[PDB]
């Protein structure tokens, strides 16, 4: 009854879709991009990456067990951290840049300190307690961190104490994605249940639920305005859900594309969206016209991660071929 009531409420407010209003909006056209920098050095497939707030330094995690930080301006490797576990699938970069978190199949995503009196990297904190593989743990502040695990639960931990301050439960399937809003007050999550959940950090109870996907959700990313987000699944369709309308706006799909998706990102203005498909390619779609606007080739294996800088100067895409390509 309650679910039927919610469905009726969300359906009754849909008479005009944004896609038809976007017809009057002029198309963005073809955005031709070329590889500006080619970061190399990984000897195994990479699984995740993050962009710094200064839009100059980036960090990546790969299967060989090395966490590498590159200076995108000069390609030089700044820091290389040897990891205890080589099965890492995620990494994160603190907004202040003092700490770096990384994890994987092991139930701990360790946080390392980059600012030490000895001038060398060292382990700062190990967050044990999860009973499943950690999909991704993202920094919330210099002392708080949000972690998404494969045990269908999320956890907010205090770095100084090492104990999870908050626990989020309710997902039936394992949560494979997690994105943080610019306000750092509420976050979206995506699981294999073909649905997404909007949570808020402070009170720690379920704020909203979105559905519509037909397969496991692998990627998620907040809209720059913070009132919307995008999700991707194995159904080769990108779905944009906004927190205030509580309904789907458009579906990005094409006949040519049939493989799944791995990463979703937004530009600085949010006009265009970037997706990384398993067919060793990236697709740049228009977030408004819902049509394809660009194709980024140049990867010899499945694309695993990609990310835009804070200032939007360039976008760096990684893949299983152990090479990172910077496009502007």
């Amino acid at each position: 009854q309650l679910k039927n009531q919610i469905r009726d409420a969300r359906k009754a407010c849909a008479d005009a879709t944004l896609s038809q209003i976007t017809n009057n909006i002029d198309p963005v056209g073809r955005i031709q991009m070329r590889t500006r920098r080619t970061l190399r050095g990984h000897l195994a497939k990479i699984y995740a990456m993050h962009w710094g707030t200064d839009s100059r330094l980036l960090v990546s995690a790969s299967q060989d067990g090395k966490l590498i930080i590159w200076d995108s301006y000069t390609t030089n490797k700044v820091h290389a951290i040897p990891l205890r576990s080589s099965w890492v699938m995620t990494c994160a970069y603190a907004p202040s840049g003092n700490y770096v978190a990384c994890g994987g199949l092991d139930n701990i995503c360790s946080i390392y300190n980059l600012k030490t009196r000895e001038g060398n990297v060292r382990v700062s904190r190990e967050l044990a307690g999860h009973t499943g593989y950690l999909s991704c743990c993202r920094f919330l502040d210099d002392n708080q961190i949000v972690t998404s695990s494969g045990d269908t639960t999320c956890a907010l931990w205090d770095i100084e104490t090492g104990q999870q301050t908050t626990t989020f439960t309710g997902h039936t399937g394992d949560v494979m994605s997690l994105s943080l809003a610019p306000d750092t007050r509420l976050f979206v999550s995506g699981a294999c249940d073909a649905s997404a959940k909007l949570w808020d950090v402070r009170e720690g109870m379920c704020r909203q639920t979105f559905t519509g996907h037909e397969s496991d959700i692998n990627a998620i990313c907040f809209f720059p305005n913070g009132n919307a987000f995008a999700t991707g699944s194995d159904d080769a369709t990108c779905r944009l859900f906004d927190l205030r309308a509580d309904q789907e706006l458009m579906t990005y799909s094409h006949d040519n594309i049939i493989c799944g998706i791995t990463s979703v990102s937004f530009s600085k203005s949010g006009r265009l969206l970037l997706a990384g498909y398993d067919d060793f390619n990236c697709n740049v779609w228009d977030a408004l016209k819902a049509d394809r606007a660009g194709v980024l080739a140049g990867h010899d294996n499945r694309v695993s991660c990609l990310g835009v800088t804070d200032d939007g100067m360039a976008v760096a895409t990684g893949s299983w071929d152990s090479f990172l390509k910077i496009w502007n």
């Binding site: 050095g41 090395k66 030089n76 699938m89 092991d106 494969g150």
Partner: protein
Amino acid sequence: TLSAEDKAAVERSKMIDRNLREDGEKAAREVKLLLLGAGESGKNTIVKQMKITGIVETHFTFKDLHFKMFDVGAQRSERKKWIHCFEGVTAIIFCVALSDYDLVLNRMHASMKLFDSICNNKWFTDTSIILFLNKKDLFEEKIKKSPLTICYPEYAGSNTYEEAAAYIQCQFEDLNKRKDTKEIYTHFTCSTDTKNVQFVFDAVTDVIIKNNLKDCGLF
């Protein structure tokens, strides 16, 4: 052209790259194995035999060859979301408990289903599988009490171990649909600890030799 700070950063990056290359070259000289099977198949027994909260890594050396074995059974989750990380392993050691043929989790059926799922996975098309059958003595003691028909209604035969073990091995080896690409090795675990290690070493050597022959175009 380049300032002092830029030059120092260039040398630091070069040193880091050289160290990373050396570490990768050192790590590339190890044979990686992936362990799979049901929890009640006596995995720990063979683990402690060869070795003497998620991924369990076991490192051991034998006849100048180093083996790193990754056990994933310690955690339960969706297999199709992290198994691709194990692509490229030299071999998959599968564990099966014969004595669980008449235990309802049906345990033998679940083991066969898991073996079918793993063997025919697209990520392990070229990955060899080494099958181990654990607890043969207790199976011999149990088979004197119940026939094979409690688990295999469509099977008729004698209740002798020499035939029952062969039938189980044939049934397990008949599940693969890519016999040309991959071969399955079956061994019976015994009290002698060195026998399992020798069988694993022989299987790994055979797999390496077959891969080399395929690369040379002979096999």
